[PDB]
């Protein structure tokens, strides 16, 4: 929320209420509606932790991510 | 027709093993 902070901005200040409500409903994606994250200005490395934990249920998830990032190059991909 | 040679090298570097990776790393450092 502190990436591009406009303190005199009612819209970005109202996003705090929205994210608190999502955090109330037990959403793991509560930072989602922050404007910098939504625009791609910030990401956190804790997401890769979620990618690893997801791999306990989705063994393909790591491979898919690297294919999108180009980290692993399979001919024909 | 250079793309054919590029594809030939692409499959070769994809099929190459970790022992080849370690060997070339040493040889690159040596030369």
Short mmCIF file of N, CA and C in Angstrom, two decimals:
data_model
loop_
_atom_site.label_atom_id
_atom_site.label_comp_id
_atom_site.label_asym_id
_atom_site.label_seq_id
_atom_site.Cartn_x
_atom_site.Cartn_y
_atom_site.Cartn_z
N UNK A 1 0.81 -1.21 0.00
CA UNK A 1 0.00 0.00 0.00
C UNK A 1 0.85 1.26 0.00
N UNK A 2 2.13 1.15 0.32
CA UNK A 2 3.02 2.29 0.46
C UNK A 2 3.89 2.52 -0.77
N UNK A 3 3.63 1.82 -1.88
CA UNK A 3 4.41 2.01 -3.09
C UNK A 3 4.32 3.41 -3.66
N UNK A 4 3.12 3.90 -3.90
CA UNK A 4 2.93 5.24 -4.43
C UNK A 4 1.85 5.91 -3.60
N UNK A 5 2.26 6.51 -2.49
CA UNK A 5 1.34 6.87 -1.43
C UNK A 5 0.85 8.30 -1.63
N UNK A 6 -0.44 8.44 -1.89
CA UNK A 6 -1.10 9.73 -1.95
C UNK A 6 -1.96 9.85 -0.70
N UNK A 7 -1.44 10.55 0.31
CA UNK A 7 -2.16 10.69 1.57
C UNK A 7 -3.40 11.56 1.42
N UNK A 8 -3.34 12.57 0.55
CA UNK A 8 -4.50 13.42 0.27
C UNK A 8 -5.22 12.89 -0.97
N UNK A 9 -5.76 11.68 -0.82
CA UNK A 9 -6.47 11.03 -1.92
C UNK A 9 -7.55 10.14 -1.31
N UNK A 10 -8.81 10.50 -1.51
CA UNK A 10 -9.91 9.75 -0.91
C UNK A 10 -10.05 8.37 -1.52
N UNK A 11 -9.75 8.23 -2.81
CA UNK A 11 -9.89 6.94 -3.48
C UNK A 11 -8.94 5.90 -2.89
N UNK A 12 -7.65 6.23 -2.83
CA UNK A 12 -6.68 5.29 -2.27
C UNK A 12 -6.91 5.04 -0.79
N UNK A 13 -7.49 6.01 -0.08
CA UNK A 13 -7.84 5.82 1.32
C UNK A 13 -9.08 4.96 1.48
N UNK A 14 -10.00 5.00 0.51
CA UNK A 14 -11.16 4.12 0.54
C UNK A 14 -10.78 2.68 0.22
N UNK A 15 -9.68 2.48 -0.52
CA UNK A 15 -9.22 1.13 -0.81
C UNK A 15 -8.80 0.40 0.47
N UNK A 16 -8.42 1.15 1.50
CA UNK A 16 -8.10 0.53 2.79
C UNK A 16 -9.32 -0.14 3.39
N UNK A 17 -10.49 0.50 3.29
CA UNK A 17 -11.72 -0.10 3.80
C UNK A 17 -12.07 -1.36 3.01
N UNK A 18 -11.91 -1.31 1.69
CA UNK A 18 -12.21 -2.48 0.86
C UNK A 18 -11.30 -3.65 1.22
N UNK A 19 -10.00 -3.38 1.39
CA UNK A 19 -9.07 -4.45 1.72
C UNK A 19 -9.30 -5.00 3.12
N UNK A 20 -9.71 -4.14 4.06
CA UNK A 20 -10.06 -4.61 5.39
C UNK A 20 -11.28 -5.52 5.35
N UNK A 21 -12.26 -5.18 4.51
CA UNK A 21 -13.43 -6.03 4.36
C UNK A 21 -13.06 -7.38 3.77
N UNK A 22 -12.20 -7.39 2.76
CA UNK A 22 -11.74 -8.65 2.19
C UNK A 22 -10.94 -9.44 3.22
N UNK A 23 -10.10 -8.76 4.00
CA UNK A 23 -9.41 -9.41 5.10
C UNK A 23 -10.37 -9.91 6.16
N UNK A 24 -11.54 -9.28 6.29
CA UNK A 24 -12.56 -9.75 7.21
C UNK A 24 -13.15 -11.08 6.74
N UNK A 25 -13.46 -11.17 5.45
CA UNK A 25 -14.05 -12.38 4.88
C UNK A 25 -13.05 -13.52 4.73
N UNK A 26 -11.83 -13.37 5.25
CA UNK A 26 -10.86 -14.44 5.18
C UNK A 26 -10.17 -14.60 3.85
N UNK A 27 -10.13 -13.55 3.03
CA UNK A 27 -9.48 -13.62 1.73
C UNK A 27 -7.97 -13.56 1.89
N UNK A 28 -7.27 -14.49 1.25
CA UNK A 28 -5.81 -14.43 1.21
C UNK A 28 -5.30 -13.38 0.24
N UNK A 29 -6.13 -12.95 -0.71
CA UNK A 29 -5.78 -11.87 -1.63
C UNK A 29 -6.49 -10.60 -1.18
N UNK A 30 -5.90 -9.94 -0.19
CA UNK A 30 -6.43 -8.68 0.32
C UNK A 30 -5.66 -7.47 -0.17
N UNK A 31 -4.37 -7.64 -0.47
CA UNK A 31 -3.54 -6.62 -1.08
C UNK A 31 -3.93 -6.38 -2.53
N UNK A 32 -4.83 -7.23 -3.05
CA UNK A 32 -5.09 -7.29 -4.48
C UNK A 32 -5.60 -5.95 -5.02
N UNK A 33 -6.46 -5.27 -4.26
CA UNK A 33 -7.11 -4.07 -4.75
C UNK A 33 -6.28 -2.81 -4.53
N UNK A 34 -5.09 -2.93 -3.95
CA UNK A 34 -4.17 -1.80 -3.92
C UNK A 34 -3.74 -1.45 -5.34
N UNK A 35 -3.78 -0.16 -5.65
CA UNK A 35 -3.50 0.28 -7.02
C UNK A 35 -2.12 -0.12 -7.53
N UNK A 36 -1.02 0.03 -6.77
CA UNK A 36 0.29 -0.35 -7.33
C UNK A 36 0.40 -1.83 -7.69
N UNK A 37 -0.08 -2.72 -6.83
CA UNK A 37 -0.05 -4.15 -7.15
C UNK A 37 -0.89 -4.45 -8.38
N UNK A 38 -2.10 -3.88 -8.44
CA UNK A 38 -2.99 -4.12 -9.57
C UNK A 38 -2.38 -3.65 -10.88
N UNK A 39 -1.52 -2.64 -10.84
CA UNK A 39 -0.86 -2.12 -12.04
C UNK A 39 0.48 -2.79 -12.32
N UNK A 40 0.92 -3.70 -11.46
CA UNK A 40 2.20 -4.35 -11.64
C UNK A 40 3.39 -3.57 -11.12
N UNK A 41 3.16 -2.51 -10.35
CA UNK A 41 4.27 -1.72 -9.83
C UNK A 41 4.99 -2.43 -8.69
N UNK A 42 4.30 -3.30 -7.95
CA UNK A 42 4.91 -4.04 -6.86
C UNK A 42 4.47 -5.49 -6.93
N UNK A 43 5.38 -6.37 -6.54
CA UNK A 43 5.04 -7.74 -6.19
C UNK A 43 5.91 -8.12 -5.01
N UNK A 44 5.48 -9.14 -4.28
CA UNK A 44 6.22 -9.61 -3.13
C UNK A 44 6.76 -11.00 -3.43
N UNK A 45 7.91 -11.29 -2.82
CA UNK A 45 8.54 -12.60 -3.02
C UNK A 45 7.85 -13.69 -2.22
N UNK A 46 6.98 -13.33 -1.28
CA UNK A 46 6.20 -14.32 -0.55
C UNK A 46 5.28 -15.11 -1.46
N UNK A 47 5.00 -14.60 -2.66
CA UNK A 47 4.17 -15.33 -3.61
C UNK A 47 4.82 -16.64 -4.04
N UNK A 48 6.14 -16.64 -4.20
CA UNK A 48 6.85 -17.87 -4.55
C UNK A 48 6.68 -18.93 -3.47
N UNK A 49 6.53 -18.50 -2.21
CA UNK A 49 6.18 -19.45 -1.16
C UNK A 49 4.85 -20.11 -1.47
N UNK A 50 3.86 -19.32 -1.88
CA UNK A 50 2.56 -19.87 -2.25
C UNK A 50 2.68 -20.80 -3.45
N UNK A 51 3.57 -20.48 -4.39
CA UNK A 51 3.80 -21.36 -5.53
C UNK A 51 4.33 -22.71 -5.08
N UNK A 52 5.22 -22.71 -4.09
CA UNK A 52 5.75 -23.97 -3.57
C UNK A 52 4.68 -24.75 -2.81
N UNK A 53 3.91 -24.07 -1.96
CA UNK A 53 2.84 -24.75 -1.23
C UNK A 53 1.77 -25.27 -2.18
N UNK A 54 1.47 -24.50 -3.23
CA UNK A 54 0.54 -24.97 -4.25
C UNK A 54 1.05 -26.22 -4.95
N UNK A 55 2.37 -26.37 -5.06
CA UNK A 55 2.95 -27.52 -5.74
C UNK A 55 2.69 -28.82 -5.01
N UNK A 56 2.32 -28.76 -3.73
CA UNK A 56 1.90 -29.97 -3.04
C UNK A 56 0.59 -30.49 -3.60
N UNK A 57 -0.23 -29.61 -4.17
CA UNK A 57 -1.48 -30.00 -4.80
C UNK A 57 -1.40 -29.96 -6.32
N UNK A 58 -0.59 -29.07 -6.89
CA UNK A 58 -0.46 -28.89 -8.33
C UNK A 58 1.01 -29.09 -8.69
N UNK A 59 1.39 -30.33 -9.03
CA UNK A 59 2.78 -30.62 -9.35
C UNK A 59 3.24 -29.96 -10.63
N UNK A 60 2.32 -29.46 -11.45
CA UNK A 60 2.64 -28.78 -12.70
C UNK A 60 2.83 -27.28 -12.53
N UNK A 61 2.50 -26.74 -11.35
CA UNK A 61 2.42 -25.29 -11.19
C UNK A 61 3.77 -24.62 -11.37
N UNK A 62 4.83 -25.21 -10.80
CA UNK A 62 6.16 -24.64 -10.94
C UNK A 62 6.59 -24.64 -12.40
N UNK A 63 6.35 -25.75 -13.10
CA UNK A 63 6.74 -25.85 -14.50
C UNK A 63 6.01 -24.82 -15.36
N UNK A 64 4.71 -24.63 -15.10
CA UNK A 64 3.93 -23.67 -15.87
C UNK A 64 4.46 -22.26 -15.67
N UNK A 65 4.76 -21.91 -14.41
CA UNK A 65 5.26 -20.57 -14.11
C UNK A 65 6.57 -20.29 -14.83
N UNK A 66 7.51 -21.24 -14.78
CA UNK A 66 8.79 -21.04 -15.45
C UNK A 66 8.64 -20.99 -16.96
N UNK A 67 7.71 -21.77 -17.52
CA UNK A 67 7.46 -21.70 -18.95
C UNK A 67 6.94 -20.32 -19.35
N UNK A 68 6.07 -19.73 -18.53
CA UNK A 68 5.60 -18.38 -18.80
C UNK A 68 6.72 -17.36 -18.63
N UNK A 69 7.54 -17.52 -17.59
CA UNK A 69 8.67 -16.63 -17.37
C UNK A 69 9.83 -16.91 -18.31
N UNK A 70 9.78 -18.00 -19.09
CA UNK A 70 10.90 -18.37 -19.93
C UNK A 70 12.06 -18.99 -19.19
N UNK A 71 11.88 -19.32 -17.91
CA UNK A 71 12.98 -19.84 -17.11
C UNK A 71 13.43 -21.21 -17.61
N UNK A 72 12.48 -22.07 -17.96
CA UNK A 72 12.79 -23.34 -18.62
C UNK A 72 12.31 -23.28 -20.06
N UNK A 73 13.16 -23.71 -20.98
CA UNK A 73 12.90 -23.60 -22.41
C UNK A 73 12.75 -25.01 -22.99
N UNK A 74 11.52 -25.42 -23.22
CA UNK A 74 11.26 -26.69 -23.87
C UNK A 74 11.00 -26.45 -25.35
N UNK A 75 11.68 -27.16 -26.25
CA UNK A 75 11.43 -26.98 -27.68
C UNK A 75 9.97 -27.26 -28.02
N UNK A 76 9.35 -26.31 -28.72
CA UNK A 76 7.95 -26.39 -29.04
C UNK A 76 7.01 -25.75 -28.04
N UNK A 77 7.54 -25.11 -27.00
CA UNK A 77 6.73 -24.45 -25.99
C UNK A 77 6.70 -22.95 -26.27
N UNK B 1 18.33 -20.46 -44.28
CA UNK B 1 18.28 -21.84 -43.81
C UNK B 1 18.99 -21.98 -42.47
N UNK B 2 19.39 -20.84 -41.89
CA UNK B 2 20.07 -20.87 -40.60
C UNK B 2 19.17 -21.39 -39.49
N UNK B 3 17.85 -21.26 -39.65
CA UNK B 3 16.93 -21.73 -38.63
C UNK B 3 17.04 -23.24 -38.43
N UNK B 4 17.37 -23.98 -39.49
CA UNK B 4 17.56 -25.42 -39.35
C UNK B 4 18.74 -25.73 -38.44
N UNK B 5 19.84 -25.00 -38.60
CA UNK B 5 20.99 -25.18 -37.71
C UNK B 5 20.67 -24.72 -36.30
N UNK B 6 19.88 -23.66 -36.16
CA UNK B 6 19.47 -23.19 -34.83
C UNK B 6 18.64 -24.26 -34.13
N UNK B 7 17.71 -24.88 -34.87
CA UNK B 7 16.90 -25.95 -34.30
C UNK B 7 17.76 -27.15 -33.93
N UNK B 8 18.75 -27.47 -34.76
CA UNK B 8 19.63 -28.60 -34.46
C UNK B 8 20.40 -28.37 -33.16
N UNK B 9 20.93 -27.16 -32.98
CA UNK B 9 21.61 -26.83 -31.73
C UNK B 9 20.62 -26.77 -30.57
N UNK B 10 19.40 -26.28 -30.82
CA UNK B 10 18.42 -26.16 -29.75
C UNK B 10 18.08 -27.52 -29.15
N UNK B 11 17.85 -28.52 -30.00
CA UNK B 11 17.57 -29.86 -29.50
C UNK B 11 18.79 -30.46 -28.80
N UNK B 12 19.99 -30.14 -29.30
CA UNK B 12 21.20 -30.67 -28.69
C UNK B 12 21.40 -30.13 -27.28
N UNK B 13 21.24 -28.81 -27.11
CA UNK B 13 21.42 -28.23 -25.79
C UNK B 13 20.29 -28.62 -24.84
N UNK B 14 19.12 -28.97 -25.38
CA UNK B 14 18.04 -29.45 -24.54
C UNK B 14 18.30 -30.87 -24.06
N UNK B 15 18.88 -31.71 -24.92
CA UNK B 15 19.16 -33.10 -24.59
C UNK B 15 20.41 -33.28 -23.75
N UNK B 16 21.26 -32.26 -23.65
CA UNK B 16 22.53 -32.42 -22.96
C UNK B 16 22.33 -32.58 -21.46
N UNK B 17 23.20 -33.38 -20.85
CA UNK B 17 23.04 -33.80 -19.47
C UNK B 17 23.73 -32.82 -18.52
N UNK B 18 23.59 -33.08 -17.22
CA UNK B 18 24.26 -32.26 -16.22
C UNK B 18 25.76 -32.49 -16.21
N UNK B 19 26.20 -33.72 -16.50
CA UNK B 19 27.63 -33.99 -16.57
C UNK B 19 28.28 -33.17 -17.68
N UNK B 20 27.59 -33.05 -18.82
CA UNK B 20 28.09 -32.18 -19.88
C UNK B 20 28.10 -30.72 -19.44
N UNK B 21 27.08 -30.30 -18.69
CA UNK B 21 27.04 -28.94 -18.18
C UNK B 21 28.26 -28.65 -17.30
N UNK B 22 28.55 -29.55 -16.36
CA UNK B 22 29.69 -29.36 -15.48
C UNK B 22 31.01 -29.43 -16.24
N UNK B 23 31.09 -30.31 -17.24
CA UNK B 23 32.32 -30.43 -18.02
C UNK B 23 32.60 -29.16 -18.82
N UNK B 24 31.58 -28.61 -19.48
CA UNK B 24 31.79 -27.40 -20.27
C UNK B 24 32.11 -26.20 -19.39
N UNK B 25 31.52 -26.14 -18.19
CA UNK B 25 31.82 -25.04 -17.28
C UNK B 25 33.29 -25.03 -16.90
N UNK B 26 33.85 -26.21 -16.61
CA UNK B 26 35.27 -26.30 -16.30
C UNK B 26 36.10 -25.93 -17.53
N UNK B 27 35.74 -26.48 -18.69
CA UNK B 27 36.52 -26.21 -19.90
C UNK B 27 36.45 -24.74 -20.31
N UNK B 28 35.30 -24.09 -20.10
CA UNK B 28 35.21 -22.66 -20.37
C UNK B 28 36.14 -21.88 -19.46
N UNK B 29 36.19 -22.25 -18.18
CA UNK B 29 37.09 -21.58 -17.24
C UNK B 29 38.55 -21.84 -17.60
N UNK B 30 38.86 -23.06 -18.04
CA UNK B 30 40.24 -23.40 -18.38
C UNK B 30 40.73 -22.60 -19.58
N UNK B 31 39.94 -22.58 -20.66
CA UNK B 31 40.35 -21.83 -21.84
C UNK B 31 40.31 -20.33 -21.61
#
